[PDB]
Design a binder for this molecule. Structure first.
Ligand SMILES: [Mg+2]
Ligand SMILES: [Zn+2]
Ligand SMILES: [Zn+2]
Lengths: 94, 55, 48, 152, 65, 258, 280
RNA sequence: GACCAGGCG
DNA sequence: GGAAGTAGTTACGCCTGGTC
């Protein structure tokens, strides 16, 4: 899932998440929002037809953690949450 | 001296037409720029060799 | 040239050549209309 | 509105200028950035039509508040460049910060603009007259005083 | 023409249920009860069985050869 | 923590409660179930002869819409890159009658139509329909033919009906009729909304303050249904593994960037 | 869906919603000119005047007619035909599909005219899956074109598990004053839930009050509004969304039959100006 | 090529 | 001044087919 950085200012990272759609982008931004060190995070699909699979992100942190750290921690939390839900589901179904 | 809309359009069109026939660009332009965009960049910078005459 | 042809009213096959035969008719029911049949060759179709 | 097109089967012709003079003429004199103001009446002809107006009302009306995620998403969707959200106006019963629609709308206005007027939503002229009386005294009313007498 | 294999809205397979629904309804049973028994709870699925026309029978008669 | 509680486990569907999870993860799970989990579906058909009334395109689409059993152990269904295994389903049918999905053969014992009673075409006297249909893995985000089933969720809400309300017993009886779990106290009656509880017209005057809904935070009632391609538990497990693998791929790409 | 545009579901289209096939029948006659100078159904040799590319005769049979069920694209010939020379070798007058039309050869028939010359009709069928620009209408006069095709996972859904097959902007309702469309949506939902079709006759049909009461008794809100969730973000919408079943019909004004573009081509002999028409 | 008819905005 | 005659116009495209 290719990352196409557009901006790398101080405490700001804007990039294209090539290959994804709303499904992963929304989860990533909502799990990034709960990080206290992130001041502004959002995403948008510039065009439903032309850029359907190229979401664009903006991650702005206060400065104590770089946006790359924020995205890494958010993805780790997503993976942990999915694993926990998988364990609960497999316990319940069996 | 303030150009009108029509004077600006004529100047930019003539400059783009000249550029398209080998007239050297008077500034530096990004690669891939179309001649019309080069003429518009020239006008926005302010280096305009063409002068309009008025009655 | 002998070509395989199918009649209109009846579905059973009729053989003739258009270039030579001035009159086209099924010689069994007298039908003037014929179908050019589907060649027995594979056809690849995308299911979408 | 300029084309009077309504997407019910409408068709439009597209002409490609071929000479550089024609291309310059089109791009300088006929672009859609210009012609926002109609030569007929000297007023805006290119503007919001139905959904822009209704969404603006749902945004800026009294009591309309938005959550942090909604505010960030709408700002990114609109294309507004921003690196920090303004201070929230209210706080939810759960402590969640909430932004007013007026603040979000103000985020995309020029920092020097200042104007007042009565729109079509004026049903009690007394409140409008009170606001005008407050404004006329000094022309720079205290923002909290206006917020006390704010009217839709 | 012929009964759709899947519900246009949610993709539930309703191809097999049409003939059972038709024969049960012709038998005089309540259509709501029949549709509930067949398992079609969402009204999108019930629309597919309730509004379908078997037009294949009326066009099978003309051959292209 | 995160709790999963199953309300109604049927053969072709399951209804469970998901607790302690944000709305974003619930929506992501629903979207991954709808468009990520891969199944087998006919993608290409080779027609040798088709004398039927339907055209080749129509029959090919109807074949693609026919659900196909998807083996689970043999193939990695949670992989981001799908396998290219192709199953050849053939049909040699002719004469008067109606062609069902159970008449299709298969080169693979595992991959075959789940329901053998789905009509394909009605054949008259003398008509022949011969084809070889090829199936391959895919995702519902590409075409609807690869959708494993249907999925949706809703908020887990408890409706409070004040017992000071006249003829509240009618509301209690309506809640019992809909099958919703209902509890009553000295001051009010609580109707857990497993299924949409809509207040009738007569009681709409109290919808503001006397009767009101309470959304339980981070709780959702899910409803997953299969088309026979996969077990519903397998569908949910594969979707969760898909989300895990997507997160892992994002982590790897992010580390590659730095 | 602004300005009378219509938003539609991709999954519904892929499952057969509003799918259609377009038929065109090309005709070629073996004309008998004066003096016994006839034309011939044949695959012309490249020595004939006006010969097209040898690729355009790919599907032709030695008889001179294209085999059925053979995929034919634009400018491919169906009836190879040569006419006696009239230039001032045999000229070519073969019949090919129209330049903007493709499809599959559904049927090739051969027959005899009234005067006795050979006549052939070739029918080409093109599959038209709905796309952006195709015109849709309801029985209440609400015309519109597909403004967007949205995946199912992006469509909103109802608490009952109902996903729309189509979304219409509310701004087209009040200016047009089509209360009948709303009543028809209510009636369609009630008919689907009951398993009995609703009588919508002009003046003796089922009253709207009866339909609303029946919808109330079936377990749904009497207004027809339902609690809906946003597909993109996952939270329920603030307002209760009006949803129902409306009978929409696809019109033959497809965007594939109307798109036209001419860089440079034939001109009229008299005025040297470009010709007139999409067909030429 | 011009005549007719039917539609579309 | 009649009181008739006469002439001159009556939106813009676009598409389809059918016959000469
Ligand atoms: Mg219009
Ligand atoms: Zn015969
Ligand atoms: Zn359904």
């Amino acid at each position: 899932m290719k990352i196409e950085v557009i901006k790398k200012e101080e405490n700001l990272l804007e990039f294209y998440l090539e290959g994804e759609d709303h499904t992963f982008a929304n989860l990533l931004v909502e799990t990034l929002r709960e990080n206290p060190h992130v001041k502004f995070t959002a995403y948008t699909i510039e065009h439903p037809i032309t850029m359907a699979r190229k979401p664009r992100f903006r991650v702005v942190t206060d400065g104590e953690i770089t946006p790359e750290e924020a995205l890494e921690e958010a993805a780790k939390k997503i993976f942990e949450r999915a694993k926990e839900v998988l364990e609960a589901w497999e316990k319940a179904v069996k | 001296f303030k150009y009108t809309r029509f004077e600006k359009a004529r100047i930019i069109g003539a400059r783009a037409l000249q550029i398209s026939m080998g007239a050297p660009v008077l500034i530096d332009v990004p690669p891939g720029i179309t001649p019309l965009e080069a003429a518009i960049l020239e006008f926005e910078k302010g280096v305009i060799p063409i002068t309009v005459i008025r009655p | 040239v002998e070509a395989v042809y199918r009649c209109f009213k009846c579905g059973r096959e009729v053989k003739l050549d258009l270039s030579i035969t001035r009159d086209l008719r099924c010689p069994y029911c007298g039908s003037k209309i014929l179908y050019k049949p589907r060649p027995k060759v594979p056809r690849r179709v995308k299911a979408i | 509105p300029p084309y009077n097109a309504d997407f019910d089967g409408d068709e439009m012709n597209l002409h490609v200028p071929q000479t550089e003079e024609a291309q310059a003429e089109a791009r300088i004199l006929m672009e859609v950035q210009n012609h926002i103001i109609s030569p007929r009446y000297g007023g805006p002809i290119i503007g919001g039509i139905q959904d822009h107006i209704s969404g603006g009302y749902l945004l800026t009306r009294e009591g309309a508040y938005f959550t942090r995620d909604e505010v960030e998403q709408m700002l990114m969707f609109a294309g507004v460049d921003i690196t920090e959200l303004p201070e929230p106006d209210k706080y939810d019963e759960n402590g969640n910060p909430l932004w007013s629609g007026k603040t979000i709308f103000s985020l995309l206005l020029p920092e020097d603009l200042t104007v007042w007027y009565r729109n079509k939503l004026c049903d009690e002229p007394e409140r409008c007259e009170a606001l005008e009386k407050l404004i006329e005294e000094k022309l720079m009313p205290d923002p909290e005083e206006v917020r006390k007498l704010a009217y839709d | 023409m012929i009964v759709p294999v899947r519900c246009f809205t949610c993709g539930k397979v309703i191809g097999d249920k049409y003939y059972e629904f038709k024969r049960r309804v012709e038998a005089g049973e309540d259509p709501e009860k029949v549709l509930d028994d067949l398992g079609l709870e969402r009204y999108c699925c019930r629309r597919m069985l309730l509004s379908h026309v078997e037009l294949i029978d009326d066009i099978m008669h003309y051959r292209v050869y | 923590g995160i709790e999963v509680q199953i309300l109604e486990k049927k053969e072709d569907s399951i209804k469970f409660v998901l607790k302690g999870v944000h709305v974003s993860f619930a929506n992501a799970l629903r979207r991954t179930i709808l468009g990520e989990v891969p199944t087998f579906a006919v993608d290409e058909v080779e027609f040798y002869e088709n004398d039927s009334a339907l055209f080749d395109e129509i029959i090919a689409h109807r074949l693609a819409m026919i659900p196909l059993t998807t083996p689970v152990d043999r193939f990695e269904l949670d992989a981001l890159e799908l396998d290219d295994y192709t199953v050849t389903l053939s049909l040699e049918a002719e004469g008067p009658g109606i062609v069902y999905s159970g008449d299709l053969k298969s080169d693979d014992p595992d991959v075959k139509p789940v329901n053998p009673n789905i009509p394909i075409v009605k054949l008259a006297e003398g008509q022949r329909l011969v084809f070889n249909a090829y199936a391959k893995l895919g995702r519902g985000k590409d075409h609807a033919k690869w959708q494993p089933g249907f999925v949706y969720y809703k908020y887990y809400t408890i409706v409070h009906i004040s017992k000071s309300i006249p003829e509240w017993k009618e509301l209690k009886k309506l809640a019992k009729k809909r099958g919703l779990p209902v509890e009553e106290t000295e001051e009010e009656v609580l109707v857990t909304t497993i299924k949409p509880f809509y207040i009738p017209k007569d009681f709409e005057e109290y919808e503001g303050k006397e009767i009101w809904e309470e959304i339980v935070p981070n709780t959702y009632i899910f409803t997953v249904e299969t088309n026979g391609e996969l077990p519903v538990e397998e569908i949910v497990s594969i979707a969760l593994k898909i989300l895990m693998r997507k997160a892992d791929r994002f982590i790897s790409e992010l580390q590659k960037l730095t | 869906n602004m300005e009378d545009a219509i938003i539609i579901n991709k999954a519904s289209i892929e499952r057969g919603l509003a799918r259609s096939t377009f038929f065109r029948t090309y005709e070629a006659e073996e004309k008998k000119y004066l003096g016994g100078q006839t034309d011939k159904f044949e695959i012309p040799d490249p020595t004939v005047r006006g010969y097209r590319g040898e690729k355009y005769y790919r599907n032709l049979d030695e008889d001179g007619l294209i085999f059925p069920e053979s995929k034919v694209e634009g400018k491919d010939v169906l009836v190879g035909r040569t006419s006696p020379p009239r230039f001032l070798e045999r000229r070519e007058t073969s019949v090919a599909v129209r330049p903007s039309e493709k499809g599959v050869v559904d049927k090739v028939i051969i027959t005899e005219t009234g005067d006795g010359t050979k006549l052939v009709k070739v029918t080409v069928r093109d599959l038209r899956i709905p796309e952006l620009g195709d015109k849709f209408a309801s029985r209440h006069g609400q015309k519109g074109v597909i403004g967007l095709i949205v995946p199912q996972e992006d469509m909103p859904w109802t608490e009952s598990g109902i996903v729309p097959d189509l979304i219409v902007n509310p701004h087209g309702i009040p200016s047009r004053m089509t209360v009948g469309q709303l009543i028809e949506a209510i009636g369609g939902k009630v008919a689907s839930l009951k398993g009995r079709r609703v009588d919508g006759t002009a003046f003796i049909g089922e009253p709207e009050e009866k339909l609303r009461k029946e919808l109330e008794e079936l377990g749904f809100k009497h207004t027809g509004r339902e609690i809906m969730y946003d597909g993109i973000t996952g939270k329920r919408l603030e307002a209760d969304i009006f949803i129902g079943v409306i009978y929409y019909q696809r019109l033959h004004h497809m965007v594939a039959d109307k798109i036209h573009a001419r860089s440079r081509g034939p001109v009229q002999v008299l005025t040297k100006q470009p010709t007139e028409g999409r067909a030429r």
